RNA sequence: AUCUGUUUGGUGGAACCUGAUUAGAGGAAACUCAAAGAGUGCUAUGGUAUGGUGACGGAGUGCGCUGGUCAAGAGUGUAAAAGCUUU
RNA sequence: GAGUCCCAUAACCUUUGUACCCCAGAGUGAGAAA
RNA sequence: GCGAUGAUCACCCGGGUGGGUACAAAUGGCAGUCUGACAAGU
């Protein structure tokens, strides 16, 4: 179970690393990524410039 | 025990009357508890023996009263003067503690004061502490009437007069069974109590 | 509870319209007490009727999902349902009147070749309907005649229309010149009022059920509330997280405002910020 | 150790209604509601008070999980004298009787049990203790015994069920007072043996937050139990933030 | 409703009896009602297996009460003859207990059956 | 849209009317949650319109069962019919808030014109009524809700458990605790009777050593001066002349050293001797009851060892359930202080204890135990006895 | 013991250092007089205030409103029906 | 002047008399007989 | 013609010393019965 931080999503997009697949590659195991309201709220406050980051964070596989 | 005899089961509580046993406020309370009682039912075989036990309790209390009345009659014939002063119950214990009337009669009045408190007395005497002042006489009526430090004084006065009356009981060859010596002795202690209690320490 | 009853993957494309209705089937009485139905339309040329299980009442104790699908020749852009009866109207390239018990449009309404971008049924004179065109026009319809009635062309497109719940002949329009216009049905030459506070396009408008206030959503990321007798807003609502207000509605008690922006969140607002929802003692109240 | 003729010093604990018996060894003891008998064979202590012969019972941490919580050092217990406590999962009087001792004559204990065979003794024990109300009913359906229970200050749940979070949820809404207490004993194996204990504890706490119960503290019951923890929370209907 | 409850079905009975047999070879099995009762007192029992045809059944109905008090799983098997045969002794066995041992070679097999018994209860 | 509220009390059914409807969209806001706690705010929401107390304890249990099963009792049907106004089944329905959803379908059947609600909005009102309780009843006689809960709680619980007085074994524990107490008191009082009459006739206490016989004789021979041939026959009838005490007392009363005590003293001796007589008879009556109760409660255990020995064994364990739960070894040491079950002698004792343990299990966990298994189990011990 | 001198407990509290406090530090009394804090108890109940200004009230008539039963009509359905919806 | 309030209406020790006991104790746990 | 519904597992010369549990009695022990002339009022 992995807690995602706001900057983690931004850097993942910069490097073209999928969150779910990238974690499975790193740990060679099923990872259950988790986003808290604070991280979701921080993404929304970043503004229109980070709309792409907000849409990936809302992927259904991310609980 | 008497309630069980009158009503055997909580069901009977509705119609049974507990007036002669209990006051109005108390009897109504048990009736309310009966219908809402948390307990379980019992068979007649159980009830019969619980009644049998209850019959023993009331019969015990009856004979206990009979023995108490018997002891009063004995004390009012073997030491009538003492009974007038200290009472039947406390006087009986004073005789029983010494083991005989003559043995008590030969004791000084100081011992009669502290007769029942040897454990406190001899502990205090050996450890250089203050000694008890009431002994078994604490339960006499006259000591009860006294208050504060006056209880210690009346014990001293009552014990002295008890020895006077007790000796007249034990050593009198032609004693009347009247308690006249005790009655006059009783008046002296009451006068001593009245003036002793009349005094007020606080300035008026 | 701020929780979903159900979620459906209704359409492959964009959901261009939605309305909650109480269907009246000819042969069947739907259980409105235990089930609530919504209609959806989308640019994939289909209108779907859904059923949702609700817990309003406990008189019972399913069939939760798609009930019927209406196919269309062209893409749809708006949908609204007649209040009194089951008929509903969809606006796409042509505004079409539908009946729930028929798979094809029962009637065809259209002033001309221009497409319709939105529509809204009247709330009191239920037979009157209004629509908006891409040609900067507002068209009025009357179902009693099964025909359009009046048309006015404005300087800019109007995105939404709402009818006054307390006044059968008055309706307000959200316009793209940063303004909202209050109109009288019988005399459309002049506006009754103009609301001017916004600084970007006004994308939706709604009346409070009391009929004394309207709320406007704008492209400028704000929500403004107007008194129907004044041409300027009494309030503005905003947040850094709210990104483009596209829909605004009033709660049916007129105490709350529901806004939906393009960041994907549906927010709840107090109609009057300083008020509170608890029941007040007489000493508070006075 | 704590043999028969040994003499001990009884002093009060930080929690009201709980005591400590000092000596070569320390014992957690509670005043006996029904003197002269033992519910489950625990040792007892008699004190001659001016004289009346008062009695105390020993609380074994290895038998009661609430007792293990006292040893481990719980900061706040809402179970205190003169309070109503709703006890869920009351298998028998092993722990309810000690809770009945703490609340005292003025308090009440609503003991809820499902299985009948443990239930029968709970009835028999309850009749020695007037302040215990046994409710032989399933805790998953509080509607069945809503007549029997009024508002309660604290809710104690020892149910070892996978869906205990819902059971604690429903009971609190009906009977627990606002700002009241909630005490839960969580055994990881019953809830989910597939995952580690830490994952289970984090999951149960999240459910309680969702149910308007604010957790105050968490404690694991070692060395008395393995893979157990007690979560103490408060029922904040108004809001947890 | 019947006194012997729950009663394992045919598929589960064989799975239980296999664990009983392996436990006997590994000295992790206690045989007999009296021995089973002791293990519950010490809290060293993974679960209790009882025979449902014990004549009379009541002479082992105390174990479920002890089990529920201690929260120990239990289950009934149809035959005491079969249970005795699996236990490894030459006589029928009405009750048996699997001793707890965290260093045993049959941990997974025991816990697999233990989980199924919990579902049955 | 809630207009009426149904609340079920241990004492009866209460119907309220909702004067104001609380906000539903803002239900989770703090101020709407606090108003439930505040009585000043709550009283503006609802008002009591009717209350129908149960007739008695019996009716309360029946309606507790019906409410538990989601059924509408006749009492509930009456109060609802009296209060709820008649409305259409389709056009518009009176709304009733009920705590339990299972109770909704039942009320709908009886009253087609009422729609039941148990959503979170309804629960909040029900929570408030429970919270403030008797304060809302404007003094109407609701008894005391806390006390009736205790009575109804035990009733409901035992009815499901089907608890019976037949399963009761504490009567055995009381009887044994009383029986030995009587055996002590009868002896202690009888010894005193010997002393008191010893003063008046000291030798007679030597003549009749058996205390019970001595008391009955003293009741007859109150004064040793009274000695008649007919009296000799009457006391000769007491017990038998085989010992010759009838002649000894007459000859010995004539020449004895006992100092005559007063009439009042003799009155105490005979009454106190009469007292020893009553307890002896009561003790035998109780002893038969213990024997009878043992057969009913534990026929197997009583038959295997005996009623008294079984009663002592149950008391030592503290209860029949406690005795059953013990292992065989513990049962053996349970009777190892009084030798209840008593190298080859020990082997029988260990063998007998195991059988006694099983006998207890049959008795404790059988609603109506028989003595069929006790007989064969005792028979098995007899064969073991003969073998050893 | 004109033996010994350590430990335990009490009495006492120089110097240096450290901390806190300072119109020095305390004590007793109360059906005394003040200024404040916290908690608890109490139907603590007008969501728009009595049926009523002869400006009125009561009795009765009509209108209006409510419930289900019946009949007919419309729609749906059928070979014909039965059955269902109806502001 | 002076501790009833640690049951002298009692506790403990000793002697005598009476009735039982000399295997493990949270007892062990698959042998026994041939 | 067995068994998990349970196999197996102090001293001294027929006699006397050693130890344990329970109860009762003892006119057996601890174990020795406080002080002694002032006090209260005007
Ligand atoms: Zn957070």
mmCIF file of N, CA, C and O in Angstrom, chain D residues 84 110 116-117 119-121 123-124 126-127 130 132-137 143-151 172-179 212 235 237-238, chain F residues 8-10 13 28 30 33-34 36-37 63-64 67-68 99-100 103 120 123-124 127 130-131 146 149-150 152-154 156-158 160-163 321 325 365:
data_model
loop_
_atom_site.group_PDB
_atom_site.id
_atom_site.type_symbol
_atom_site.label_atom_id
_atom_site.label_comp_id
_atom_site.label_asym_id
_atom_site.label_seq_id
_atom_site.Cartn_x
_atom_site.Cartn_y
_atom_site.Cartn_z
ATOM 1 N N UNK D 84 -23.594 4.113 32.004
ATOM 2 C CA UNK D 84 -24.222 3.027 31.269
ATOM 3 C C UNK D 84 -23.299 2.574 30.149
ATOM 4 O O UNK D 84 -22.842 3.391 29.345
ATOM 5 N N UNK D 110 -25.337 -3.363 29.631
ATOM 6 C CA UNK D 110 -26.184 -4.044 28.657
ATOM 7 C C UNK D 110 -25.318 -5.067 27.936
ATOM 8 O O UNK D 110 -24.616 -4.734 26.978
ATOM 9 N N UNK D 116 -26.564 -19.221 22.446
ATOM 10 C CA UNK D 116 -27.412 -19.485 23.604
ATOM 11 C C UNK D 116 -26.638 -20.143 24.738
ATOM 12 O O UNK D 116 -26.852 -19.808 25.909
ATOM 13 N N UNK D 117 -25.740 -21.085 24.423
ATOM 14 C CA UNK D 117 -25.061 -21.813 25.496
ATOM 15 C C UNK D 117 -24.232 -20.884 26.374
ATOM 16 O O UNK D 117 -24.351 -20.973 27.608
ATOM 17 N N UNK D 119 -24.987 -17.863 26.590
ATOM 18 C CA UNK D 119 -26.034 -16.990 27.089
ATOM 19 C C UNK D 119 -26.617 -17.464 28.403
ATOM 20 O O UNK D 119 -26.894 -16.658 29.294
ATOM 21 N N UNK D 120 -26.802 -18.780 28.550
ATOM 22 C CA UNK D 120 -27.470 -19.301 29.740
ATOM 23 C C UNK D 120 -26.728 -18.903 31.007
ATOM 24 O O UNK D 120 -27.352 -18.510 32.000
ATOM 25 N N UNK D 121 -25.398 -19.000 30.995
ATOM 26 C CA UNK D 121 -24.624 -18.589 32.160
ATOM 27 C C UNK D 121 -24.669 -17.083 32.349
ATOM 28 O O UNK D 121 -24.643 -16.603 33.487
ATOM 29 N N UNK D 123 -27.181 -15.247 31.929
ATOM 30 C CA UNK D 123 -28.391 -15.019 32.716
ATOM 31 C C UNK D 123 -28.137 -15.346 34.180
ATOM 32 O O UNK D 123 -28.502 -14.577 35.077
ATOM 33 N N UNK D 124 -27.522 -16.500 34.447
ATOM 34 C CA UNK D 124 -27.274 -16.908 35.825
ATOM 35 C C UNK D 124 -26.329 -15.940 36.525
ATOM 36 O O UNK D 124 -26.534 -15.600 37.696
ATOM 37 N N UNK D 126 -26.005 -12.793 35.743
ATOM 38 C CA UNK D 126 -26.656 -11.490 35.838
ATOM 39 C C UNK D 126 -27.518 -11.369 37.084
ATOM 40 O O UNK D 126 -27.848 -10.257 37.496
ATOM 41 N N UNK D 127 -27.927 -12.493 37.671
ATOM 42 C CA UNK D 127 -28.877 -12.440 38.772
ATOM 43 C C UNK D 127 -28.149 -12.248 40.097
ATOM 44 O O UNK D 127 -28.768 -11.939 41.123
ATOM 45 N N UNK D 130 -27.417 -7.143 39.979
ATOM 46 C CA UNK D 130 -28.650 -6.494 39.506
ATOM 47 C C UNK D 130 -28.429 -5.487 38.393
ATOM 48 O O UNK D 130 -29.386 -5.157 37.684
ATOM 49 N N UNK D 132 -26.648 -5.754 35.630
ATOM 50 C CA UNK D 132 -26.385 -6.342 34.320
ATOM 51 C C UNK D 132 -27.722 -6.708 33.693
ATOM 52 O O UNK D 132 -28.558 -7.358 34.330
ATOM 53 N N UNK D 133 -27.925 -6.286 32.451
ATOM 54 C CA UNK D 133 -29.117 -6.607 31.675
ATOM 55 C C UNK D 133 -28.679 -7.500 30.517
ATOM 56 O O UNK D 133 -28.124 -6.996 29.530
ATOM 57 N N UNK D 134 -28.895 -8.816 30.580
ATOM 58 C CA UNK D 134 -28.472 -9.678 29.470
ATOM 59 C C UNK D 134 -29.455 -9.596 28.312
ATOM 60 O O UNK D 134 -30.671 -9.650 28.506
ATOM 61 N N UNK D 135 -28.919 -9.456 27.106
ATOM 62 C CA UNK D 135 -29.710 -9.340 25.887
ATOM 63 C C UNK D 135 -29.209 -10.426 24.948
ATOM 64 O O UNK D 135 -28.213 -10.235 24.242
ATOM 65 N N UNK D 136 -29.896 -11.565 24.922
ATOM 66 C CA UNK D 136 -29.490 -12.688 24.078
ATOM 67 C C UNK D 136 -30.066 -12.398 22.695
ATOM 68 O O UNK D 136 -31.157 -12.843 22.340
ATOM 69 N N UNK D 137 -29.312 -11.638 21.907
ATOM 70 C CA UNK D 137 -29.737 -11.236 20.577
ATOM 71 C C UNK D 137 -28.501 -10.972 19.733
ATOM 72 O O UNK D 137 -27.412 -10.722 20.255
ATOM 73 N N UNK D 143 -32.054 -3.274 15.817
ATOM 74 C CA UNK D 143 -33.476 -2.966 15.843
ATOM 75 C C UNK D 143 -34.257 -3.951 16.697
ATOM 76 O O UNK D 143 -35.344 -3.614 17.176
ATOM 77 N N UNK D 144 -33.733 -5.162 16.890
ATOM 78 C CA UNK D 144 -34.481 -6.183 17.607
ATOM 79 C C UNK D 144 -34.575 -5.867 19.094
ATOM 80 O O UNK D 144 -35.597 -6.152 19.729
ATOM 81 N N UNK D 145 -33.526 -5.275 19.670
ATOM 82 C CA UNK D 145 -33.503 -4.954 21.092
ATOM 83 C C UNK D 145 -33.455 -3.453 21.348
ATOM 84 O O UNK D 145 -32.801 -3.015 22.297
ATOM 85 N N UNK D 146 -34.136 -2.653 20.527
ATOM 86 C CA UNK D 146 -34.147 -1.214 20.765
ATOM 87 C C UNK D 146 -35.026 -0.861 21.957
ATOM 88 O O UNK D 146 -34.789 0.144 22.636
ATOM 89 N N UNK D 147 -36.052 -1.671 22.223
ATOM 90 C CA UNK D 147 -36.877 -1.449 23.405
ATOM 91 C C UNK D 147 -36.059 -1.595 24.681
ATOM 92 O O UNK D 147 -36.264 -0.855 25.649
ATOM 93 N N UNK D 148 -35.134 -2.548 24.698
ATOM 94 C CA UNK D 148 -34.432 -2.949 25.909
ATOM 95 C C UNK D 148 -33.356 -1.968 26.348
ATOM 96 O O UNK D 148 -33.024 -1.939 27.536
ATOM 97 N N UNK D 149 -32.812 -1.165 25.436
ATOM 98 C CA UNK D 149 -31.639 -0.341 25.701
ATOM 99 C C UNK D 149 -32.016 1.125 25.554
ATOM 100 O O UNK D 149 -32.674 1.507 24.581
ATOM 101 N N UNK D 150 -31.604 1.937 26.524
ATOM 102 C CA UNK D 150 -31.637 3.377 26.395
ATOM 103 C C UNK D 150 -30.292 3.917 25.951
ATOM 104 O O UNK D 150 -29.405 3.182 25.512
ATOM 105 N N UNK D 151 -30.135 5.229 26.077
ATOM 106 C CA UNK D 151 -28.867 5.839 25.705
ATOM 107 C C UNK D 151 -27.768 5.382 26.653
ATOM 108 O O UNK D 151 -27.986 5.242 27.859
ATOM 109 N N UNK D 172 -23.794 2.226 17.752
ATOM 110 C CA UNK D 172 -23.466 3.567 18.224
ATOM 111 C C UNK D 172 -24.528 4.575 17.810
ATOM 112 O O UNK D 172 -24.920 5.435 18.605
ATOM 113 N N UNK D 173 -25.011 4.484 16.572
ATOM 114 C CA UNK D 173 -25.984 5.457 16.091
ATOM 115 C C UNK D 173 -27.273 5.399 16.900
ATOM 116 O O UNK D 173 -27.884 6.436 17.178
ATOM 117 N N UNK D 174 -27.708 4.200 17.282
ATOM 118 C CA UNK D 174 -28.959 4.071 18.020
ATOM 119 C C UNK D 174 -28.820 4.527 19.466
ATOM 120 O O UNK D 174 -29.660 5.281 19.967
ATOM 121 N N UNK D 175 -27.763 4.083 20.153
ATOM 122 C CA UNK D 175 -27.705 4.136 21.607
ATOM 123 C C UNK D 175 -26.607 5.013 22.186
ATOM 124 O O UNK D 175 -26.769 5.494 23.310
ATOM 125 N N UNK D 176 -25.509 5.238 21.478
ATOM 126 C CA UNK D 176 -24.393 5.966 22.062
ATOM 127 C C UNK D 176 -24.681 7.459 22.094
ATOM 128 O O UNK D 176 -25.212 8.024 21.136
ATOM 129 N N UNK D 177 -24.335 8.094 23.209
ATOM 130 C CA UNK D 177 -24.524 9.529 23.343
ATOM 131 C C UNK D 177 -23.468 10.292 22.552
ATOM 132 O O UNK D 177 -22.336 9.840 22.372
ATOM 133 N N UNK D 178 -23.853 11.478 22.092
ATOM 134 C CA UNK D 178 -22.910 12.356 21.420
ATOM 135 C C UNK D 178 -21.741 12.660 22.344
ATOM 136 O O UNK D 178 -21.918 12.876 23.545
ATOM 137 N N UNK D 179 -20.536 12.664 21.778
ATOM 138 C CA UNK D 179 -19.295 12.776 22.536
ATOM 139 C C UNK D 179 -19.095 11.602 23.484
ATOM 140 O O UNK D 179 -18.321 11.700 24.438
ATOM 141 N N UNK D 212 -18.048 8.548 11.746
ATOM 142 C CA UNK D 212 -18.111 9.680 12.662
ATOM 143 C C UNK D 212 -17.583 9.342 14.050
ATOM 144 O O UNK D 212 -17.956 9.992 15.028
ATOM 145 N N UNK D 235 -17.315 9.394 19.977
ATOM 146 C CA UNK D 235 -18.387 9.492 18.990
ATOM 147 C C UNK D 235 -18.724 10.964 18.811
ATOM 148 O O UNK D 235 -19.489 11.546 19.578
ATOM 149 N N UNK D 237 -20.612 13.193 16.583
ATOM 150 C CA UNK D 237 -21.597 13.334 15.518
ATOM 151 C C UNK D 237 -21.434 14.658 14.788
ATOM 152 O O UNK D 237 -21.599 14.724 13.566
ATOM 153 N N UNK D 238 -21.118 15.725 15.523
ATOM 154 C CA UNK D 238 -21.035 17.050 14.918
ATOM 155 C C UNK D 238 -19.959 17.097 13.841
ATOM 156 O O UNK D 238 -20.176 17.644 12.753
ATOM 157 N N UNK F 8 -41.349 3.137 20.258
ATOM 158 C CA UNK F 8 -41.705 1.978 21.060
ATOM 159 C C UNK F 8 -40.957 2.040 22.384
ATOM 160 O O UNK F 8 -39.723 1.989 22.405
ATOM 161 N N UNK F 9 -41.699 2.140 23.477
ATOM 162 C CA UNK F 9 -41.151 2.176 24.821
ATOM 163 C C UNK F 9 -41.383 0.834 25.502
ATOM 164 O O UNK F 9 -42.261 0.066 25.093
ATOM 165 N N UNK F 10 -40.610 0.512 26.542
ATOM 166 C CA UNK F 10 -40.949 -0.676 27.339
ATOM 167 C C UNK F 10 -42.327 -0.582 27.964
ATOM 168 O O UNK F 10 -42.972 -1.608 28.203
ATOM 169 N N UNK F 13 -46.635 2.273 23.586
ATOM 170 C CA UNK F 13 -46.411 2.900 22.291
ATOM 171 C C UNK F 13 -46.719 4.386 22.389
ATOM 172 O O UNK F 13 -47.746 4.775 22.951
ATOM 173 N N UNK F 28 -25.799 16.593 7.656
ATOM 174 C CA UNK F 28 -24.502 16.295 8.247
ATOM 175 C C UNK F 28 -23.811 17.529 8.807
ATOM 176 O O UNK F 28 -22.745 17.400 9.417
ATOM 177 N N UNK F 30 -22.949 20.523 11.374
ATOM 178 C CA UNK F 30 -22.852 20.349 12.819
ATOM 179 C C UNK F 30 -24.062 20.931 13.537
ATOM 180 O O UNK F 30 -24.548 20.351 14.514
ATOM 181 N N UNK F 33 -26.875 18.705 13.813
ATOM 182 C CA UNK F 33 -26.606 17.583 14.702
ATOM 183 C C UNK F 33 -26.705 18.007 16.160
ATOM 184 O O UNK F 33 -27.109 17.214 17.018
ATOM 185 N N UNK F 34 -26.339 19.254 16.460
ATOM 186 C CA UNK F 34 -26.380 19.727 17.836
ATOM 187 C C UNK F 34 -27.811 19.951 18.304
ATOM 188 O O UNK F 34 -28.113 19.786 19.491
ATOM 189 N N UNK F 36 -30.283 18.182 17.888
ATOM 190 C CA UNK F 36 -30.814 16.930 18.419
ATOM 191 C C UNK F 36 -30.462 16.797 19.894
ATOM 192 O O UNK F 36 -31.258 16.296 20.694
ATOM 193 N N UNK F 37 -29.261 17.231 20.275
ATOM 194 C CA UNK F 37 -28.868 17.176 21.678
ATOM 195 C C UNK F 37 -29.613 18.212 22.510
ATOM 196 O O UNK F 37 -29.985 17.943 23.657
ATOM 197 N N UNK F 63 -45.330 -7.794 22.920
ATOM 198 C CA UNK F 63 -45.069 -6.745 21.943
ATOM 199 C C UNK F 63 -43.576 -6.565 21.711
ATOM 200 O O UNK F 63 -43.158 -6.151 20.625
ATOM 201 N N UNK F 64 -42.755 -6.872 22.715
ATOM 202 C CA UNK F 64 -41.315 -6.895 22.492
ATOM 203 C C UNK F 64 -40.942 -7.971 21.482
ATOM 204 O O UNK F 64 -40.073 -7.757 20.630
ATOM 205 N N UNK F 67 -42.337 -6.734 17.967
ATOM 206 C CA UNK F 67 -41.497 -5.676 17.421
ATOM 207 C C UNK F 67 -40.149 -6.237 16.992
ATOM 208 O O UNK F 67 -39.562 -5.788 16.001
ATOM 209 N N UNK F 68 -39.629 -7.215 17.733
ATOM 210 C CA UNK F 68 -38.385 -7.857 17.330
ATOM 211 C C UNK F 68 -38.548 -8.574 15.997
ATOM 212 O O UNK F 68 -37.646 -8.543 15.153
ATOM 213 N N UNK F 99 -38.492 3.260 13.334
ATOM 214 C CA UNK F 99 -37.081 2.944 13.511
ATOM 215 C C UNK F 99 -36.650 1.782 12.626
ATOM 216 O O UNK F 99 -35.567 1.818 12.031
ATOM 217 N N UNK F 100 -37.479 0.747 12.521
ATOM 218 C CA UNK F 100 -37.102 -0.507 11.882
ATOM 219 C C UNK F 100 -37.725 -0.599 10.496
ATOM 220 O O UNK F 100 -38.930 -0.384 10.338
ATOM 221 N N UNK F 103 -40.362 -3.375 9.961
ATOM 222 C CA UNK F 103 -41.704 -3.078 10.442
ATOM 223 C C UNK F 103 -42.537 -2.333 9.409
ATOM 224 O O UNK F 103 -43.757 -2.241 9.567
ATOM 225 N N UNK F 120 -32.131 8.059 7.152
ATOM 226 C CA UNK F 120 -31.312 8.698 8.176
ATOM 227 C C UNK F 120 -32.014 9.893 8.801
ATOM 228 O O UNK F 120 -31.771 10.210 9.970
ATOM 229 N N UNK F 123 -34.185 8.383 11.472
ATOM 230 C CA UNK F 123 -33.384 7.886 12.588
ATOM 231 C C UNK F 123 -32.970 9.020 13.516
ATOM 232 O O UNK F 123 -32.921 8.845 14.739
ATOM 233 N N UNK F 124 -32.674 10.193 12.956
ATOM 234 C CA UNK F 124 -32.261 11.322 13.781
ATOM 235 C C UNK F 124 -33.366 11.739 14.740
ATOM 236 O O UNK F 124 -33.100 12.055 15.903
ATOM 237 N N UNK F 127 -33.595 9.093 17.384
ATOM 238 C CA UNK F 127 -32.489 9.247 18.318
ATOM 239 C C UNK F 127 -32.785 10.341 19.332
ATOM 240 O O UNK F 127 -32.440 10.214 20.512
ATOM 241 N N UNK F 130 -35.349 9.070 21.946
ATOM 242 C CA UNK F 130 -34.641 8.214 22.888
ATOM 243 C C UNK F 130 -33.769 9.039 23.823
ATOM 244 O O UNK F 130 -33.669 8.741 25.018
ATOM 245 N N UNK F 131 -33.134 10.084 23.294
ATOM 246 C CA UNK F 131 -32.186 10.864 24.079
ATOM 247 C C UNK F 131 -32.872 11.587 25.229
ATOM 248 O O UNK F 131 -32.387 11.564 26.366
ATOM 249 N N UNK F 146 -36.071 3.280 32.833
ATOM 250 C CA UNK F 146 -34.879 2.517 33.179
ATOM 251 C C UNK F 146 -35.242 1.241 33.925
ATOM 252 O O UNK F 146 -34.645 0.184 33.691
ATOM 253 N N UNK F 149 -36.998 -1.493 31.718
ATOM 254 C CA UNK F 149 -36.043 -2.125 30.815
ATOM 255 C C UNK F 149 -35.399 -3.339 31.467
ATOM 256 O O UNK F 149 -35.178 -4.361 30.809
ATOM 257 N N UNK F 150 -35.086 -3.244 32.760
ATOM 258 C CA UNK F 150 -34.467 -4.363 33.460
ATOM 259 C C UNK F 150 -35.391 -5.573 33.486
ATOM 260 O O UNK F 150 -34.972 -6.696 33.187
ATOM 261 N N UNK F 152 -38.075 -6.205 31.509
ATOM 262 C CA UNK F 152 -38.326 -6.683 30.155
ATOM 263 C C UNK F 152 -37.080 -7.311 29.547
ATOM 264 O O UNK F 152 -37.177 -8.261 28.762
ATOM 265 N N UNK F 153 -35.902 -6.788 29.882
ATOM 266 C CA UNK F 153 -34.681 -7.344 29.326
ATOM 267 C C UNK F 153 -34.463 -8.790 29.726
ATOM 268 O O UNK F 153 -34.131 -9.631 28.890
ATOM 269 N N UNK F 154 -34.638 -9.097 31.013
ATOM 270 C CA UNK F 154 -34.497 -10.474 31.473
ATOM 271 C C UNK F 154 -35.567 -11.367 30.860
ATOM 272 O O UNK F 154 -35.294 -12.506 30.467
ATOM 273 N N UNK F 156 -37.250 -11.050 27.958
ATOM 274 C CA UNK F 156 -36.999 -11.302 26.545
ATOM 275 C C UNK F 156 -35.839 -12.269 26.361
ATOM 276 O O UNK F 156 -35.906 -13.192 25.544
ATOM 277 N N UNK F 157 -34.767 -12.076 27.131
ATOM 278 C CA UNK F 157 -33.578 -12.907 26.975
ATOM 279 C C UNK F 157 -33.868 -14.359 27.322
ATOM 280 O O UNK F 157 -33.511 -15.265 26.562
ATOM 281 N N UNK F 158 -34.516 -14.603 28.460
ATOM 282 C CA UNK F 158 -34.753 -15.984 28.879
ATOM 283 C C UNK F 158 -35.750 -16.687 27.969
ATOM 284 O O UNK F 158 -35.641 -17.898 27.741
ATOM 285 N N UNK F 160 -36.091 -16.475 24.768
ATOM 286 C CA UNK F 160 -35.343 -17.037 23.649
ATOM 287 C C UNK F 160 -34.475 -18.202 24.101
ATOM 288 O O UNK F 160 -34.393 -19.229 23.418
ATOM 289 N N UNK F 161 -33.811 -18.058 25.251
ATOM 290 C CA UNK F 161 -33.017 -19.152 25.805
ATOM 291 C C UNK F 161 -33.882 -20.289 26.321
ATOM 292 O O UNK F 161 -33.370 -21.397 26.528
ATOM 293 N N UNK F 162 -35.181 -20.060 26.505
ATOM 294 C CA UNK F 162 -36.086 -21.078 27.036
ATOM 295 C C UNK F 162 -35.629 -21.539 28.416
ATOM 296 O O UNK F 162 -35.689 -22.725 28.747
ATOM 297 N N UNK F 163 -35.159 -20.594 29.227
ATOM 298 C CA UNK F 163 -34.694 -20.934 30.564
ATOM 299 C C UNK F 163 -35.845 -21.486 31.391
ATOM 300 O O UNK F 163 -36.971 -20.987 31.331
ATOM 301 N N UNK F 321 -23.001 -26.993 35.884
ATOM 302 C CA UNK F 321 -22.248 -26.631 34.688
ATOM 303 C C UNK F 321 -20.752 -26.604 34.966
ATOM 304 O O UNK F 321 -19.950 -27.042 34.134
ATOM 305 N N UNK F 325 -17.806 -28.974 33.034
ATOM 306 C CA UNK F 325 -16.713 -28.400 32.257
ATOM 307 C C UNK F 325 -15.349 -28.873 32.746
ATOM 308 O O UNK F 325 -14.367 -28.784 32.004
ATOM 309 N N UNK F 365 -26.333 -31.070 30.074
ATOM 310 C CA UNK F 365 -26.628 -30.669 28.705
ATOM 311 C C UNK F 365 -27.849 -31.376 28.131
ATOM 312 O O UNK F 365 -28.042 -31.365 26.911
#
